[model samples]
Target chain A: LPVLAPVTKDPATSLYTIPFHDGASLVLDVAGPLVWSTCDGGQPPAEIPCSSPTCLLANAYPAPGCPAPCTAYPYNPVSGACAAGSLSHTRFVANTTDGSKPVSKVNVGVLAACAPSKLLASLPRGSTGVAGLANSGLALPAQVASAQKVANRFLLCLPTGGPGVAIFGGGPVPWPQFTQSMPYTPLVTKGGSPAHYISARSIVVGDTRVPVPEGALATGGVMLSTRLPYVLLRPDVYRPLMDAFTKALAAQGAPVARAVEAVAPFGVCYDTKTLGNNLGGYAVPNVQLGLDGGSDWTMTGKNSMVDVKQGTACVAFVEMKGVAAGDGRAPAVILGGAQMEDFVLDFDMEKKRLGFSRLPHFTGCGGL
Target chain B: AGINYVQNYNGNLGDFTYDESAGTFSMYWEDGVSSDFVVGLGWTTGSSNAITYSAEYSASGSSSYLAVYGWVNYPQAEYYIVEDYGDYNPCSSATSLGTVYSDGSTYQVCTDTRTNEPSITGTSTFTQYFSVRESTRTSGTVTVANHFNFWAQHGFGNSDFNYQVMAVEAWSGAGSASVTIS
Candidate 1:
């Protein structure tokens, strides 16, 4: 069933209905069960010197289209999505190059068993690896698999082909219908097949305490480099970056990718009982200017511990949905445990400034 | 002179009544009465002894709050000695008057145990769950009192989100308590 809209804005109103309010929401109807990945044979991937045949031997496979004593080697990891033009085969993978981990060069012998002295006698060189190889496909496939698993698990199944995402997350309004308007029957529309779904699902595993690991905060625009220093990508940047990454994966068909934004409410703290004459903004990081303190959900000491200094907090739930609208393409779901404030604020400040003022506001309080 | 009103007990007091003109006196009491008396002496003897043994009323020490109800005197005896003092236990359902006394000299004294236990009862005040909100939020005061109201506070928490109110209340003793809301 669809909700009804009372007002009309555009002239070519197809559905004649009220539009869904713009905000993050999960379409459970398009959801599927969640599945976690198990490493092949339960063994961890191998690590070795960035330049060595043993490294390749530790992780290599018999390449396709190669002859005896020779085989084609797969390409190493790549950064960013492979630029595709107007294709629904959404492939958004990252070969991180933010210098977070030391990138190991795949040591390969282009020709089969050919020595430097007998270079002419060897098989022609063409991405041929030394005798051994690992899973044999580029790491992108693993990332794709992970993404697909997330989307399929989180969203409900929809009839219009595959559950996919619009340019915006789950909230970009497609159309609005009014109360007196005829029900939205996707089958009734001339070209409308069915409502697509973004079946994204995710889990967040974290240490029992802080500070959270740096790599765990990787996001889009910031390359997921394999360098150690790159592990500590700025928390404020990577969070939205991660959302953008997931959104890009979902919005593959659409050229536009927009990050959702909201301001976390401030001034929700314990004992904010101030009085007398001059009442004004005590502008701190987490604060609000008003006549009185807000709802103090921290009724219990333990629950109140959630916010120590402010003693209370404002919360925002940002959800992503709808991946490349189609019949069979299931979008990927990424569950990020990192706080998304910095990325959200940055995005709002830059691209979606006009929409920033529309976020939900709540007041809270607690004791120190 | 002859002895009159001779009495003896384990308590601290002793006594004898005299017929001054007849020059005769006697001391007597129930079998359990345990005071000893001495004749022809000032109220200064410090131990309990008997007429069968002179200086019988001289005592070494005695318990405090032991009533010195009995008396000691000559046929014309003028002074009565008291070593210890005891008050009766007032909360008992039984009607019995216990007695006590001391010798003439100053000796160590102990307090009575009968007066230690008495009926004790009272009231308490504590707060359970408290919550407040302000649209035009104004300054307010919150006060808590009594066990019944404490239960009420726990019962009426503000936020229905969790529908719970957890708190800690400490009772120092009867009629006193403090509560902390979490």
Candidate 2:
């Protein structure tokens, strides 16, 4: 059976969908497969980071996903989304759609690695550690194995500024239905982490193309991180990207302004109201990411800019720190969730290839 | 004679009481320790959620302040303290954000996110601490939403509202405080 699930836009859960277990459904991060629950019995998981790796009271029932034994670290102050004294273990849960077949002994991370959704009530959506979470939890491979008789793959399609879909397991039949053409890219698997790293060559802002250095996009040039909010580039690549973006905005008569005050993590901001009447009519430059095999992943204004306040829209890209030193190289640059909006990202582990195609705006869950 | 009333325990720590008849709340602490008491509501958001509240407070303490504060759980245990009035230490390493006018008053906004905050609950590391100008108004509504918006506008937040409280915070000296919120 195909597992087509609704995309949850609630930032408290880092903008993902529900994963059902033992008839119990909870929001699971698409970037990582960790089961997190509030230590306060059935209290809702507050949107905060767990104070430390180990969180719990002295006598409270052990929460899921800590280091081990669950009993050793019992006394600590609880904070953020994680309750104190959390534990991690493999548990069996029959699929909500089908109870007959059960996915057993799923190794889940209890708490500690939630960075994407930890910040912001809204705007400048965050990023999650793709390689760390996927490799640590061993989730991707297990989900593929558990899904027998069906094609061992997953497809995630996030809408622009709205809800979307995430199908755990499915075949090629549904691919053509959602997109016009599916272009393939080799998924990097060796040497580095087993996250989804592809060979992206350059970035094109409007008519000007900014060539990316080879070392920057080498082994782990760009990793697909759904949990993060902005596209983080190596400083070598980011310097040019920012320049091109600034130039394009200038050409369009839209001068980008450094915010009067510092906005943590975001460097560029614009006041839509004060920018000017001419700026209001200006169009945001289109950004095309050049990938291996001459394939280009393009993004429009909606996917690149975020409305942070009532009158402010900020550029949603960040520079990967410390990459500019020495050889000016970095291990990996992340293509975050905001840049991937409205794109159907299909991952086929069996075929060892990742595919992308444009998806339509969210009609409704019923249509999917 | 010290008149004190122990309120019912809400979800958070300490005795938190809500009186519907007088539209008031009072949080009692034995000695003056670094702690706070508040009554408010929580809401969810995309970037982060927030707490909206109103409070009227009076307390006898040297260290601490009676203020409207929004506490968030994510990115660590952060507090957005808009002091309506009192004496709580804002922060040791607070950077002045100059002054801005809001809600009919001009404020000297300063912020600090250091983890050495002895006045807050739980562990504090990289927590967003915004301290607006201290106030002397003893009985009035304290709006937290405006302060939250101000912080967000300044690029200070990427978190959510897990809980909110309007209370008299005690830093060094122990004191009995009563808060009335309608």
Candidate 3:
């Protein structure tokens, strides 16, 4: 029912993108609040009146003319760069997929902000713009759903190689045998942020339950992101999670991987020789998150560790910066892109639930 | 200590490493470089600057381009055989000069005049010629001679060559790549 777009993971930036604007790759942020791109025309772009209600949804400004044209601040997430630009309508081009092949073509106009060429610096080179897939009405999902008259829910099966897909609404979904029994946890919203949050009640490392602070999971919650390459945890949550994983590894039969040194974003590294190999990845302890409604989301060895250099690999989790130990300003946990790759997640608005599926038949491996 | 080749750049292109054993050049770009990363040998026009290359690349973001980029001395011109790019097309705003067929595809050709812009020999006026392909790929065989011959036929490239390169130029983007030219 919902429109579909082919998605990809940028090898250099580790950002996810989709084919947008006549087959040009546009960075796809699953939690972004606005849709924007670098636009050019031989003639001047038409601007809407500042008083337009659509401008209210955006961070708009009134110029000296008291607003002949509506303005927007389309900010870059990584660079933390924000610039004012004209706010207007942008035509979206995408195809509808019934899980596998494209079934139909869908083109619709949605609210968008135009950015300067300078704003394009440091992104996937040649990316014309960014497409937001958050909960906002102006985001890609809602606009495409409204135009094509489909359900608001969408399924994202991120790819590790070749083509990945983002399907909106209905019909023969992928892995039909497992869809009916797919584990789902309710989605949550924190503050006014457009990010998708889920309640992670407790963390399970191997067979041990980590001690999580009282307000840590309740107040800040866990966010799913498509931009960051690694997991980030608040101090109160990170301290215990790291300790539990270390002790659990030895208990689970993995040789004691000596903690070598702290790698750049990752705070812990281990000797690659100590970590044995398995189909899943380095033979390390498995980590799972006990979710609301009693569902368990997990990360296996392949998803839990990263090889930084020849002889060393580090835990793929990092300590978040800026926020203090007990600060509720930051999320307790951020499930990043690399871990989300090759996994299927369904953000179903109508059901208010997040459905997760770990691929069992892919690449002759499972237990993720 | 080592043999020299033709290369030019403007902004931060990150670390570019050369391996003589395999005759390969690899670039690991982490910054949002404002310009390009180019590496190839220099040869003058009338000197048969023919080349074939194999590249494994991945560039993401919004504004980026990968091409066979070079310059000419007598005419003071830059030429591009753009193979793949992100979202923005380099030929979109340039002066349209029709099209040419090369390597099983028709390329949209364009030319633009740069006024007192930075060139290989410093700031000078020059013409930028382009042949941008419609389809895109990361690895392929490029017949640089074919595009060069067509440009001359189209009343362009009327000078000796300055430098030719397999350029991975970008802005507001990131990618990792390696190339081998023969």
Candidate 4:
């Protein structure tokens, strides 16, 4: 009824990975449109032609350049590089786990888009390709669900360091008993996009409840993504959110921090020595997102702070630019991979809910 | 007098009888070529080759090595994790970044940059990283992750993986190998 794969977090690259192709790894992108990677040194059992419906569904429109007969768009999420790749059939192998331990290995064939070596720029060193787990028809959750005859629900328990677990379909979960410990938020969609968004109703930074996006998620709202390690909010939402966060630190009479040079993707950097420390991390402010379902998904300072260098620590939120760029990049808020680290998050399509619970330090998402 | 030379059906350069279930390969390279004759598994590109190996190597005369060897693309780099050597030590000419104690002994780690040389991709400028063991061993484990971790920590990796093999390389010398890789 379910399938599982062990996930590892690369220290050098800060990307999550799934073990496949005989213990090698593939980077995981939560908002990717398709499951694709570098497919060198393999025999393609089948290929989709441009005249076929599979090709049109994969690409949507015809494009020039690259190989013919089923051209797919392969994007390097880490580097933000996109290129036209080819689509074909291939075998993906993974050691199946029921919930806690490995059961058996399965070889399932799925439609895979192929990329070249150049597309691997800035990716994790040993990773082969990306396993896109978006809400699209061709994404990993859907494709693997159909091939294995399982439910469309997928659970992700990301790790801060070392290995974690990702379970596909509706069976047992990593922490079955603790499923009730967290909240179930409504998972929504917008404008025929492959992205998965959460209906975030309110934003509370410390005691200050900042302005909520129009109708909870219009004009810019929250999308959960693994493509970026840090959260990205549209300039409109980011400005107010940062204002509330920065003032909340001062309002609570925390230690005075002479904000240092902002780090890349993190605009609020401070000397680690300037900040007070606690179990939840930099003793600054905690973030809470009230869902349309009337539950608050809280993020402690532990997941919301980043140690950039020796003495520098920054808030884990970036400002998104240009709303006219495209509807694709126009989400007001994006709760990134880092923000969800160590959280047992489930995208239950059957229930149309996103269930999540944060794990304690001792309860790592490693092994059992 | 005629000597014997053979190749693997899977396009391997030299013959080292492979019995997958037995999990070992045996080779005797006599007056033969070819830089390195390693009987082990290699992939299309590099991977997080978290593998352990025990090998038997006996050699005489000239330069020789029993090591984990691999290549990388883009910059076309070459690398070695030498467990034992004969006559000449390859890392001697390298710029020492110091040593790493792993598996059993302290290993000397270094890197050498080549301006332009023949590579798997073609003639190009590339770098070579090395980790040579302080003591020689014919039978023991070569825990690869330890060396790769230490090497990558010291700014040695960037290029894409090409091939990595547990090879027995000889230069005008004969070497024998019986490798059991786990």
lDDT tens digits by residue: candidate 4, B1-182: 01112212111333467655555666666544322233454444655555466777777543567777777665466778888886667666458988999877999998866432234532235667889999878667666677777877766564477766665655334556777666
**Against the hidden true structure, what lDDT does model 3 obtain?**
0.68
Q: For candidate 2, lDDT tens digit of each residue in A1-368?
A: 54544554444433443433333333333434333322323322334334433332211232244433232232111121322323433232323223112334332222332222332222223312111124222343334445334555676666432346665555553533334246678776644234567777666887687766555556446777765567777677777788888666765543544344436567777665433221111246767777786566766554566656566766777777656622423444577766665567777766767787643211112113
Q: Output the lDDT of residue A282, model 2.
A: 22
Ranking by lDDT: 4, 3, 2, 1
* Residue-wise C-alpha lDDT for candidate 1, range A1-368, written one tens digit per residue: 11111211111210011111121111111001110111122122233342455333312332223221111122111111111011011122112111111133221111111111121111112211111111111222122224333111110001111111111111222211101111111111111111121111111211111122333322111111110101122333224433433332233321332222222322122221210001011111111101011110001111111122232221111222333222122212221111110011101101211110100001010000
DockQ of 1: 0.01
Minimal lDDT window, size 10, model 3 chain A: A359-368
Best by lDDT: 4
Stretches > 4 Å off in candidate 4: A61-68, A212-216, A252-255, A324-329, B1-182
Chain A TM-score compared with the true chain A, each model in order: 0.16, 0.67, 0.89, 0.91
Worst 10 residues of 2 chain A by lDDT: A71-80
Docking class of 2: incorrect
Question: Model 1 misses residue B98 by how many Å?
Answer: 82
Q: Give the Cα lDDT of each candidate.
A: 0.17, 0.47, 0.68, 0.68
Ordered from best to worst TM-score, the candidate numbers read 4, 3, 2, 1
RMSD of each: 36.5, 23.4, 17.4, 21.2
lDDT of residue A112 for candidate 3: 73
TM-score of each: 0.15, 0.48, 0.62, 0.63
Give the DockQ (2 decimals) of all models.
Answer: 0.01, 0.01, 0.01, 0.01
Residue-wise C-alpha lDDT for candidate 4, range A1-368, written one tens digit per residue: 46778788787787899976755578888878677777765736255667887776677422223232667777777777767778867676875766656789888777878888788888788887888887777778888889988888898988765467888876755553334345677777666566778867678887578974454345326788887778887776777888888887765454686589987867788787667653244667878787776666767666677777888888887777666322434676888877787678888877777887765322346433
What digit string (tens of lDDT, one per residue) describes model 2 on residues B11-66? Answer: 13234555544446655554433212333322222223232334444444434456
Instruction: Name the candidate that leads on TM-score.
Output: 4
Off by over 4 Å in 3: A42-47, A60-68, A170-172, A250-256, A361-368, B1-182
